[PDB]
Amino acid sequence: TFKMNTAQKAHYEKFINALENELKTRHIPAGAVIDMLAEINTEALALDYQIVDKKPGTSIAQGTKAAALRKRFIPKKI
């Protein structure tokens, strides 16, 4: 993340934290993850970065924490 600016990082962290919070109470199926990626990347585009799923097409388990989420959903400047 040293490559990204403060706006990109703030947006990304807001997403990671929101996702962790969602996952406190539920599992998120693979199809929902795909839809989520489109939603968040449509926003991230306005900030000139994208989030890449390193485990594409998979679900996310309940209780997954921010640290694990950051290893899977990686931000890259466009």
What resolution in angstrom units was achieved for this structure? 1.8
Element (H, E) at 73: strand 73-77
Identify the CA nearest to 49 among candidates 7, 19, 18.
7
Total number of domains in the chain: 1
Query: What are the b/e assignments for 13-25, b being 16+ CB within 10 Å?
Result: eebbeebbeebee
CATH of the domain at 29: 6.10.250.2300
DSSP state of 27: -
Method in brief: X-ray
d(CA 29, CA 59): 4
* Domain extent for 74: 1-78
Q: Which residues pair with 58 in a beta bridge?
A: none
